[PDB]
């Protein structure tokens with residue numbers, strides 16, 4: 443809706459996973475195109491760039507019909523605004539954005555470690571986990587929202603962050619109860635639960 | 643929640659400059675509060691005195707309301723003052739271009755500020771990304787999105803204004819991008835800001 447949405451990315455979670463989580467949450471049907479399923483992802487990406495008119499030669503790429511959408515954050519924000527999971531006020535829209543940008547700071551650090559340890563594990567992670575803990579405390583019953591009294595993409599971003607972190611470091615939410623409960627809450631959402639338990 | 647707008651940052655362009663350019667362009671009166679007395683000490687006191695979410699600047703204080711994160715502040719400011727995008731998809735493209743600016747600005751900052759080898763940026767990043775922005779301007783026939791100025795126009799301007807502080811004549815092979823930068827720089831409010839800027 444549509445009517446044919448194609449997400450282009452490598453065979454990984456990475457920069458596309460939050461877009462996939464947003465699609466799963468909103469029940470948006472789409473083609474999840476992944477480079478590397480058909481053997482060589484490097485050649486398939488090279489061919490993709492010739493085929494599709496990408497503005498920055500990067501993925502994820504969201505294609506809506508002939509419409510080419512690039513940049514994870516821009517796509518996430520575009521989808522969240524279109525389907526009203528960005529905040530129930532002008533200021534709440536900002537807070538979701540602020541939190542999302544904060545996620546990007548600590549997620550980048552995780553990406554730089556996981557994909558490309560000491561500094562992250564001892565200095566960045568616990569400090570930034572404290573930041574989000576305090577932000578939940580500010581706003582927080584089985585519901586855990588970072589913004590207002592409804593789900594924002596910020597919730598899904600923080601969930602994706604620590605879900606991505608907890609694949610490499612499982613015990614990282616032990617000392618952060620609200621963040622742990624937020625993870626549990628988001629992971630068990632009707633639309634979210636099925637996607638995460640059934641994804642590769 | 644109102645009146646007194648105060649921007650907190652270091653005495654540098656960095657992550658607050660675009661916000662400063664946006665205030666300048668819009669003609670918004672604000673206190674441009676810059677750290678450093680001792681910057682490192684003042685910032686330590688700032689964190690103790692202000693309730694920042696991530697212990698980072700820029701911080702935008704509107705009354706007693708605390709705003710953090712450059713991009714979020716920029717996007718908030720653009721919506722409130724109507725330099726956000728003149729449609730739903732125009733807002734996306736502005737955001738996309740802004741996100742593109744961040745990708746290459748980050749690469750510039752790594753070499754310009756954090757002592758990374760300049761060659762990779764100069765030979766591999768800068769001209770490739772300048773070509774991306776050049777092509778995006780070509781698609782819009784200066785303005786990146788729509789028929790009016792968006793924050794994306796100021797973001798691109800800020801990007802290459804920052805780049806030219808260390809690497810002048812980088813827009814020689816990029817006429818549309820060079821003319822875009824020159825058009826934004828000659829806007830009365832921007833022109834005035836640049837002249838007063840140290």
Ligand SMILES: N[C@H](CCC(=O)N[C@@H](CS)C(=O)NCC(=O)O)C(=O)O
Pocket residue numbers: 452457499500501502512513514515741745
């Ligand atoms: N600005 C990022 C871009 C993500 C990114 O760096 N994409 C990588 C994924 S491996 C890519 O397609 N790289 C292309 C290349 O290295 O040339 C976003 O949020 O979309």
Ligand SMILES: N[C@H](CCC(=O)N[C@@H](CS)C(=O)NCC(=O)O)C(=O)O
Pocket residue numbers: 543544547652656657697698699700710711712713
């Ligand atoms: N996510 C960035 C954060 C900017 C940032 O990294 N701020 C630096 C400026 S030097 C800072 O306050 N550093 C925190 C510290 O090192 O304690 C944003 O757009 O606001």
Ligand SMILES: [Cl-]
Pocket residue numbers: 456457553
């Ligand atoms: Cl990544």
Ligand SMILES: [Cl-]
Pocket residue numbers: 656657751
């Ligand atoms: Cl910077």
